[PDB]
Amino acid sequence: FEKMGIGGLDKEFSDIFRRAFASRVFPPEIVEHVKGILLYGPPGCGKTLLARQIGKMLNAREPKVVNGPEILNKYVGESEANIRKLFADAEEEQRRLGANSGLHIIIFDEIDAICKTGVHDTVVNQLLSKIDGVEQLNNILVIGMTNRPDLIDEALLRPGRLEVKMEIGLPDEKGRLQILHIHTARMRGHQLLSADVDIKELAVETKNFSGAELEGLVRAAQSTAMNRHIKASTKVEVDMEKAESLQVTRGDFLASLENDIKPAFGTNQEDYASYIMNGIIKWGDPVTRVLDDGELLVQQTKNSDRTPLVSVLLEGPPHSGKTALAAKIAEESNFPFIKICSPDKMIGFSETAKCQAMKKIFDDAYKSQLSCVVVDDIERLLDYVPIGPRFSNLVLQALLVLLKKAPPQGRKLLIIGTTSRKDVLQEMEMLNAFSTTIHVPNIATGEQLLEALELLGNFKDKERTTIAQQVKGKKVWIGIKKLLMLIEMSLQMDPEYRVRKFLALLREEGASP
Amino acid sequence: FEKMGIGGLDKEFSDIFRRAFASRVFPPEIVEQMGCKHVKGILLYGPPGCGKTLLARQIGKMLNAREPKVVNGPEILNKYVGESEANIRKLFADAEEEQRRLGANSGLHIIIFDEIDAICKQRGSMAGSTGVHDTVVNQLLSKIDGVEQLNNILVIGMTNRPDLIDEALLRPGRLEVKMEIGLPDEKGRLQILHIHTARMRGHQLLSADVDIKELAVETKNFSGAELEGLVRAAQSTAMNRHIKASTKVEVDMEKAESLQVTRGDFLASLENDIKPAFGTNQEDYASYIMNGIIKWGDPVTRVLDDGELLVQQTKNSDRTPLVSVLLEGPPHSGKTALAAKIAEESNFPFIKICSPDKMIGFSETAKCQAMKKIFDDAYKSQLSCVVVDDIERLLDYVPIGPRFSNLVLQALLVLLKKAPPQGRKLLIIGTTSRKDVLQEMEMLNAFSTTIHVPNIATGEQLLEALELLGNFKDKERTTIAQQVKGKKVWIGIKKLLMLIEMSLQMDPEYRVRKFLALLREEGASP
Amino acid sequence: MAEDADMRNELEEMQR
Ligand SMILES: Nc1ncnc2c1ncn2[C@@H]1O[C@H](COP(=O)(O)OP(=O)(O)OP(=O)(O)O)[C@@H](O)[C@H]1O
Ligand SMILES: Nc1ncnc2c1ncn2[C@@H]1O[C@H](COP(=O)(O)OP(=O)(O)OP(=O)(O)O)[C@@H](O)[C@H]1O
Ligand SMILES: Nc1ncnc2c1ncn2[C@@H]1O[C@H](COP(=O)(O)OP(=O)(O)OP(=O)(O)O)[C@@H](O)[C@H]1O
Ligand SMILES: Nc1ncnc2c1ncn2[C@@H]1O[C@H](COP(=O)(O)OP(=O)(O)O)[C@@H](O)[C@H]1O
C-alpha cells in the first residue's frame, strides 16, 4: 500500500477495502450497497490523496468534484438546480442499463461549507432528498472530507446516506519511517544523498510531526544543500561547476530541523531536579542517621497491612538543608508516584485556590497503588506572621483532615512534611497528627567544618592550616547553605585578603544554641 | 387502582378524584344549573422515584385528554431579555386558539411542570433586592389566571421542596389541591411486586418456590424504581446462569430452560446489586471499623450495654421520640469504632454517618446545607439513626484566638432540638475529644446523656490486648509481663497498634528492646 | 445575573 505514496494508514485502507468494495467484488449470484463516506482529521494527513487514489483504483468513470461552495448563486432556484445536474447521468444509467450499470463517484471538498437561511436549508434538503429519496439508487458513492467534524449537520450522518465514517490521525514511528522512506527514495536512487544520514535517527527525532511537515523538513534540507551553489548580493547565480555534484549531508537536516520546521505542539517543564542543586556531601554521622530512618519508614510503609498510611515531620533550624534530604529520601523510595508540593507555584493565591491545588494533588496520589508526597515550608503554606499572630485557618483545617484520611482499600501512601518552626505547630495542635519526627542539626564542632571544607575543596593547605589553628579549639554553630554563601562572598577579593575576610565573616556569624 | 399500573396509593387517588374531578363526570345539565367552575391545577410532592409522572400521565389518559405538554423548569431559563417569558408564554397558544374557535365545545389540554420550584420563588418586597427571575413568576401568574378566562386547561406541578414556592401561586384560584407521595409500606410493596411480575407469571417463567410475600418483607425502605430494578437484575442473573449451564455441559436444552425459573437469583441480586437511597449501607462499616472490636476489658461491655439501653428506649417510647448521646474520651481511645458498632447493632431501616472527610475545602454554608440535607432525608423514615463524628473538626476550632465557625454551631444547636413529624423516631450519636470546649460553648446541655471511653491503664489489660492481637511469643511474653506487671500504664489501642507495627520492622533479635523503648518514651499517667 | 444587553444586526440582499 506504500505504492500510492501514503504511509501509516495501511490498516485504515484494509478497513476501507473490507467495508466498501467487498460487496462489489463478491460474486453477484451470492449477493443476489454503501453509498456514503466521510473522512475527517487534522490538516495535512493525506485525505486528498486517499480520495484521489480511491477514485483511480476502481475501474469506473472519471469522478466529479465540486470545489467548495460553487453551488451558491444570487438568483432564485439556481442553487438547487445545480445539484440536480450532478445525478443526471446516474439516473439515466440506472433507468437504461438497470443493475448492469457502472459505478458513479462524487467527491465533496470542504463539505461543511454547504451543509450545516433560505439558500442553505434548501440546498441541504435537495441534497438529502437526492441521495436518499423515493427513487433508490444502488450505483452511486459520495465522499466528503472535513477538518471540523463538529460543524456538520446531524441529519446527513444517519444510516443510508453517510455510512462509513473514518478518522485520519498523526502517524506513529513506523508510519513516519514509511513517509521518510517514500520521500527519500528518489534521492537515494540517484545517489544524491550522503552516506552519513540515518533515517532512523530522523524518525526518532521528529516527534508530533505530520506527513506534510516531514516533507517540508526534507524540502528545507534540500534548499540548505542547494544554496551552497547559489551566489547573491550582486546577481543570482547557479555555480554549475559544483552544483552538478550536490550531496545532502546530515548537518543540513539538523539545521533544517532547528529553525525551518517546528512540531507546533506544547512542551513539558520539569522542576524536581531544581530541589537538589549542589548534591549531598557527607560531613558527619547525622546525615547517615537521617537516611537510615527514612529507609526504615519507607520499608514500613511498603510492607504494612493494617497501617497503610504513615506520616513524618522533618525538624531543624534555618539554612540547615531540610528540603534536599526529603527530596533525596523520596527519590530513593522508588515508588511509581512521587510529587512535591511547594508554595513557589502559588503566589498571589487566596485560601480557596491553595485548598483546591492541594486537593487535586492528593486526588492524583490516591489513584496509584503506592504513593509518596512531600510538603515543604508549612509555615509559608499557611502563611504565618508572629504579629497578632495571623494565619489562614482554612488551610490548617484542610491539612488536619488530610493527614488522617486513608486511601482506598489496598493502597499505600506516605507523607513527609518539613518545617523550621516546631513550637508554632505544637501550639496549633498539629504535631500530634504526625506519627514521628526527625531532627536535622547544624555543624557543631570545628572538625566537621574542616571536613566539609575539605570535601568542598575551596581552600588549599596553607590557608587550611591557619583556619585549623583558629577554629579547631572552639565550638561553632552554622548551617551549610550559609557556609557556601560566606565562602562565595569571601572568594571575591584578591588572594591576599581572602582568609582574613572569611574568618571575619565567620566571627560575625558565630553564635550558640 | 391497581388495574392501571399504580399500586400503593389508593387513598391519594380517591381523594384527588373526589376533590378535583367529581364535576368532570357528573352530567352536564345539573353542573350548568349549579353554576360551578372546574379546578384549575394541583400540586404533587414527595421523594424522587415514587410515581408522580406515572400518576400525572394516567390522569391525563383517564379523562380522554389530548397529549400532554411536558416541561422541565431549569431548561426554560435563557440569558437574553424577553426569551424565558416567551418560552413560558408559548405553552398556552393552542388552548387559547381552540377556545376562541370552538367556545364551550372544546377539548381538554394538560400542562405538566417538572421541578416547578426552580422557576417560582418568593418575590422580593424590598426595593433594590428583587430576585433574578421575578419576571418569569409574574408571567406565569398572569397566564394561569388573568383578565381573559380559559376553561379548557389543567396544570399539574411536581416538586420536592414545597416550602420555597410563592404563596400567590397556591391560592384557591391557582393550584389549590395538594398531595404527598411517600415511601410505600409492606402492602404497597406487595402490590408493586405483583404488578411487576405479571408478565413472568403469565409466560410461565416463575418457579414454584418463589414467595413474593417474603421478598416484600425483606425490602424495607425501597421505592418502586428499586423494586423494578430488582426484578430486572434477577432476570438478568437467571439468564447468566442459563448461559453458564449451557456452555459448561452437553446437557439437554430442556433442562437448561427448566433452570430458567428463578428463586436464588432474587437473593443474589438483593445483596450485590441494589443499593437503596433511604436504607442502610454496609460499605461504610468497613471504612470506620477496620481492625474489628477486641474485648480487652470490662469497659467495652459497659459502653455496649449503655448503647443497647438507649436504642431500646428510643424504639419503645412515645413521650420521648427524640434522644441524643455524646461519646467523649482521650485521644486515640477509639470512639468512632464503638459509635459505629452501636449504630450497626441497632437494626434500624435507616442509618447514615456525617463526617468531615467529605467536606474538604467547603465553606460553612455548604457544610450547613449538607447537614440539613442529611437530616431532611432522615425525617422521611419511621426509625432513624444518625452519627455526627469529630464535632471539633466540623466547627474549625483552633486554640489560638480561639477561632471557629458560628453558623455551624448554631445549626447544630437548633438541630439537636427539632423533632420529626408525628409518629416518627430518631436517635443521634455524637463523638468528641475536647469536652471542656463544648461545655464552654454551652452545647453539653443540649445532649441527653454522656458516656466515657477510657484508656488502657493496667499491665494485665495490656497483656490481654497483646494476647488477643497475637504478635509476640511465649518467651517475649514472659519478658514483657515481668517488666510491666506494675499497673501504671497509659496507652490507647490505636497507638498501641501503631507501636507494634513500628516495632516489628527491626531485626528479629532487636524487637522487644525497641518495643519497650517506644513504650517508655510514651506517657504513663493522666 | 444581568440579562444580555440588546444587539444590532447585519442584513444580506438577494436578487431574482
Ligand atoms: N501520510 C502521508 N503520507 C505521505 N505524504 C503525506 C502524508 N500526509 C501528507 N503528505 C504530503 O502532504 C501533501 C498531501 O496533502 P493532502 O492534500 O492530501 O492533505 P489533507 O489532509 O487533504 O489536507 P487539508 O485538510 O489541509 O486540505 C503531499 O505533499 C503529501 O506528500
Ligand atoms: N548534606 C547536605 N544536606 C543538605 N543539603 C546539602 C548537603 N550538602 C549540600 N547541600 C546543599 O545545600 C543546600 C541546602 O539548602 P536547602 O534549600 O535544602 O535548605 P533549607 O534548610 O530547606 O532552607 P531554608 O530554611 O532557608 O528555607 C542545597 O543546595 C543542597 O544541595
Ligand atoms: N475494642 C476496640 N475499641 C475500639 N477500637 C478498636 C478496638 N479493637 C480494635 N480497634 C480498632 O482500633 C481503631 C480505633 O481507632 P478510632 O478511629 O476509633 O479512634 P479515635 O479515638 O476516633 O481516634 P482519633 O480521634 O485520635 O482520630 C480502629 O481500627 C478499630 O478497628
Ligand atoms: N407506585 C408505583 N407502581 C409501579 N411502578 C412505579 C411506582 N412508582 C414508580 N414506579 C416505576 O418507577 C419508574 C420511574 O418513576 P417516576 O414516576 O419517574 O418517579 P417520579 O415520581 O420521581 O417521577 C416508572 O417507570 C415506574 O414503572
- Best probe of the B interface among A358, A361, A391, A397, by most B CBs < 10 A, is A397
Summarize chain C as % helix, strand, coil (round to 5): 0, 5, 95
Measured CA to CA, the distance from residue B4 to residue B447 in angstroms comes to 50
B228 lines ligand 4 (CB under 6 A): yes
B331 lines ligand 3 (CB under 6 A): yes
Q: What are phi and psi of A316, to 5 degrees?
A: 175, 165
Task: Return the residue matching grid coordinates 437503596.
Answer: B276
- Say yes or no for a CB contact (<8 Å) between A359 and B357: no
CA dihedral angle for residue B182, residue B187, residue B193, residue B198, rounded to 10 degrees: -120
**Quick one: which of B503, B518, B446 has its CA closest to B472?**
B503
CA dihedral angle for residue A475, residue A481, residue A485, residue A490, rounded to 10 degrees: 30
Neighbours of A310 (CB within 10 A): 22
Residue type, A403: L
Q: Which listed ligand is nearest to B229 at the C-alpha? A: 4
In chain B, the largest separation of any two C-alpha atoms, in whole Å, equals 105
Contact A220, A261 (CB under 8 A): yes
C-alpha cell at B470: 497475637
Measured CA to CA, the distance from residue A435 to residue A438 in angstroms comes to 11
Nearest chain B alpha carbon to C7 = B80
Atom of ligand 1 nearest to the CA of A168: 21
Contact B13, B59 (CB under 8 A): no
End-to-end CA distance of chain C: 46
The SS3 of residue A429 is: coil
- DSSP assignment of A325-354 equals HHHHHHHHH--SEEEEE-GGG-SS--HHHH
* Residues in A touching B291 (Cβ below 8 Å): 306
Contact A156, A162 (CB under 8 A): yes
A480 lines ligand 2 (CB under 6 A): yes
Measured CA to CA, the distance from residue A167 to residue A175 in angstroms comes to 16
User: Does residue A301 have an active-site annotation?
Assistant: no
Residue type, A184: T
Q: Which residues lie closer than 8 Å to B281 by C-beta, 6 or more apart? A: B275, B351, B352
Contact A416, A326 (CB under 8 A): yes
Residue whose Cα lies nearest atom 31 of ligand 2: it is A278
Measured CA to CA, the distance from residue C14 to residue C16 in angstroms comes to 7
Task: Report strand pairing: A64-67 vs A309-315.
Answer: unpaired
Neighbours of B141 (CB within 10 A): 16
Q: What are phi and psi of B304, to 5 degrees?
A: -65, -40
Strands (E), B10-96: 41-45, 69-72
Residue whose Cα lies nearest atom 10 of ligand 2: it is A280
> Which of the following is catalytic: B52, B220, B335, B352?
B335
Residue B326, beta-bridge partner list: B430, B450
* Residues in A touching C10 (Cβ below 8 Å): none
> Which of the following is catalytic: A184, A249, A323, A445?
A323
Contact C2, B78 (CB under 8 A): no
Q: Which residues lie closer than 8 Å to B104 by C-beta, 6 or more apart? A: B151
- Data resolution in angstroms: 3.0
User: Does residue B336 have an active-site annotation?
Assistant: yes
Peptide bond into B402 cis (omega under 30): yes
Which H helix or E strand runs over B431? strand B425-432
**Quick one: which of A243, A252, A196 has its CA closest to A224?**
A252
Measured CA to CA, the distance from residue A428 to residue A422 in angstroms comes to 10
3-state secondary structure B187-254: HHHHHHHHHHCHHHHHCCCCCCCCCHHHHHHHCCCCCHHHHHHHHHHHHHHHHHHHHHHHHHCCCCHH
> What's the sign of the alpha-carbon dihedral A150, A151, A154, A155?
negative
Q: What are phi and psi of A212, to 5 degrees?
A: -60, -40
Which H helix or E strand runs over B388? strand B383-388
User: Does residue A404 have an active-site annotation?
Assistant: yes
**Quick one: which of B192, B197, B195 has its CA closest to B222?**
B192
CA dihedral angle for residue B521, residue B522, residue B525, residue B526, rounded to 10 degrees: 140
Angle at which helices B459-469 and B493-503 pack, to 10 degrees? 60
C-alpha cell at A419: 518545617
The answer on whether A398 is annotated among ligand-binding residues is: no
Q: What are phi and psi of A478, to 5 degrees?
A: -155, 150
C-alpha cell at B418: 427539632
Which H helix or E strand runs over B435? helix B435-440
Contact B381, B223 (CB under 8 A): no
The answer on whether B332 is annotated among ligand-binding residues is: yes
Measured CA to CA, the distance from residue B235 to residue B262 in angstroms comes to 8
* Residues in A touching C12 (Cβ below 8 Å): none
Contact A145, A51 (CB under 8 A): yes
Residue A511, beta-bridge partner list: none
Q: Which listed ligand is nearest to B2 at the C-alpha? A: 4
Supply the DSSP symbol for A259. I
Strands (E), A423-510: 436-439, 443-445, 475-478
Measured CA to CA, the distance from residue A59 to residue A331 in angstroms comes to 65
Neighbours of A40 (CB within 10 A): 19
Nearest chain C alpha carbon to B82 = C3
Measured CA to CA, the distance from residue B496 to residue B291 in angstroms comes to 13
Measured CA to CA, the distance from residue A349 to residue A397 in angstroms comes to 18
Neighbours of B473 (CB within 10 A): 8
Residue A144, beta-bridge partner list: A38, A108
C-alpha cell at B46: 414527595
C-alpha cell at A222: 534540500
Measured CA to CA, the distance from residue B443 to residue B394 in angstroms comes to 14
Contact A378, A341 (CB under 8 A): no
Measured CA to CA, the distance from residue B431 to residue B339 in angstroms comes to 8
Task: Return the residue matching grid coordinates 452545647.
Answer: B443
Supply the DSSP symbol for A161. T
> Is B46 exposed, middle or buried, given 0-12, 13-18 or 19+ CB atoms closer than 10 A?
buried
Supply the DSSP symbol for A198. -
Contact A141, A34 (CB under 8 A): yes
- What technique determined this structure? cryo-EM
CA distances from B270 to A82, A233, B226 (A): 65, 89, 10
A53 lines ligand 1 (CB under 6 A): no
Measured CA to CA, the distance from residue B330 to residue B502 in angstroms comes to 22
A85 CA distance to ligand 3 centroid (A)?
83
Task: Return the residue matching grid coordinates 518467651.
Answer: B475
Measured CA to CA, the distance from residue A100 to residue B199 in angstroms comes to 52
Q: Does B124 touch chain A (CB under 8 A)?
A: no
Q: Does B81 touch chain C (CB under 8 A)?
A: yes
Task: Return the residue matching grid coordinates 559544483.
Answer: A242
Which H helix or E strand runs over B383? strand B383-388
The answer on whether A477 is annotated among ligand-binding residues is: no
Measured CA to CA, the distance from residue B161 to residue B117 in angstroms comes to 7
B294 lines ligand 3 (CB under 6 A): yes
C-alpha cell at A400: 488536619
Within 116-135 of B, beta carbons closer than 8 Å to C belong to 132
Measured CA to CA, the distance from residue A455 to residue A282 in angstroms comes to 9
Measured CA to CA, the distance from residue A217 to residue B133 in angstroms comes to 60
> Is A54 exposed, middle or buried, given 0-12, 13-18 or 19+ CB atoms closer than 10 A?
buried
Residue whose Cα lies nearest atom 4 of ligand 1: it is A6
Contact A452, A480 (CB under 8 A): yes
Neighbours of A508 (CB within 10 A): 9
Left if phi > 0, otherwise alpha if psi is -120 to 50, otherwise beta: which for A110? left
Q: What are phi and psi of A309, to 5 degrees?
A: -115, 135
Which H helix or E strand runs over B325? strand B322-328
Measured CA to CA, the distance from residue A295 to residue A39 in angstroms comes to 56
Task: Report strand pairing: A412-418 vs B41-45.
Answer: unpaired
Measured CA to CA, the distance from residue A424 to residue B293 in angstroms comes to 37
Contact A170, A41 (CB under 8 A): no
CA distances from B134 to A301, A453, B137 (A): 59, 78, 5
CA distances from B52 to A314, B47, B69, B109, B219 (A): 60, 10, 15, 19, 21
A227 CA distance to ligand 1 centroid (A)?
26
3-state secondary structure B138-152: HHHHHHHCCCCCCCC
Measured CA to CA, the distance from residue B206 to residue B265 in angstroms comes to 11
Q: How many helices (H) and strands (E) does chain A have?
A: 21, 12
3-state secondary structure B86-124: HHHHHHHHHHHHHHHHHCCCCCCEEEEEECHHHCCCCCC
- Say yes or no for a CB contact (<8 Å) between B79 and C3: yes
B40 lines ligand 4 (CB under 6 A): no
User: Does residue B40 have an active-site annotation?
Assistant: no
Q: Which residues lie closer than 8 Å to B27 by C-beta, 6 or more apart? A: none
B335 lines ligand 3 (CB under 6 A): yes
* Residues in A touching B501 (Cβ below 8 Å): 300, 304, 306-307
End-to-end CA distance of chain B: 68
CA A47 to chain CA centroid, Å, is 26
- Say yes or no for a CB contact (<8 Å) between A401 and B356: yes
The answer on whether B178 is annotated among ligand-binding residues is: no
Neighbours of A338 (CB within 10 A): 18
**Quick one: which of B210, B208, B278, B268 has its CA closest to B238?**
B268
B226 CA distance to ligand 4 centroid (A)?
9
Supply the DSSP symbol for A260. I
Nearest chain C alpha carbon to B83 = C3
Which H helix or E strand runs over B327? strand B322-328
Neighbours of A103 (CB within 10 A): 18
Which H helix or E strand runs over A214? helix A211-227
- DSSP assignment of A384-408 equals -BTTTTB--HHHHHHHHHHTT-PPS
C-alpha cell at B30: 345539573
**Quick one: which of A74, A71, A140, A80 has its CA closest to A111?**
A71
The SS3 of residue A441 is: coil
CA distances from B186 to A295, B88, B145, B215 (A): 61, 42, 42, 10
**Quick one: which of A167, A172, A175 has its CA closest to A7?**
A175
- Say yes or no for a CB contact (<8 Å) between C6 and B79: no
Contact B54, B223 (CB under 8 A): no
Neighbours of B41 (CB within 10 A): 21
> Which of the following is catalytic: B69, B435, B494, B495?
B494
Contact B68, B61 (CB under 8 A): no
* Residues in A touching C15 (Cβ below 8 Å): 74-75
Contact B416, B430 (CB under 8 A): no
> What's the sign of the alpha-carbon dihedral B175, B177, B183, B186?
negative
Q: What are phi and psi of A322, to 5 degrees?
A: -95, -45
A319 CA distance to ligand 2 centroid (A)?
7
**Quick one: which of B157, B125, B121 has its CA closest to B40?**
B157
* Cα three-residue angle B499-B503-B507, rounded to 5 degrees: 175
- DSSP assignment of A17-29 equals HHHTTHHHHS-HH
**Quick one: which of B164, B167, B51, B48 has its CA closest to B116?**
B164
Q: Does B393 touch chain A (CB under 8 A)?
A: yes
Peptide bond into A43 cis (omega under 30): no
CB contact burial A415-425 (16+ within 10 A = b; e otherwise): bbbbbbeeebb
**Quick one: which of B377, B81, B471 has its CA closest to C4?**
B81
**Quick one: which of A330, A299, A320 has its CA closest to A417?**
A330
> Is A206 exposed, middle or buried, given 0-12, 13-18 or 19+ CB atoms closer than 10 A?
buried
Contact A95, A89 (CB under 8 A): no
Contact B224, B184 (CB under 8 A): yes
> Which of the following is catalytic: B145, B284, B377, B390?
B390
CA distances from A435 to A285, A403, B454, B465 (A): 24, 10, 22, 21
Task: Return the residue matching grid coordinates 553564635.
Answer: A511
The answer on whether B119 is annotated among ligand-binding residues is: no
User: Does residue A377 have an active-site annotation?
Assistant: yes
Measured CA to CA, the distance from residue A122 to residue A342 in angstroms comes to 61
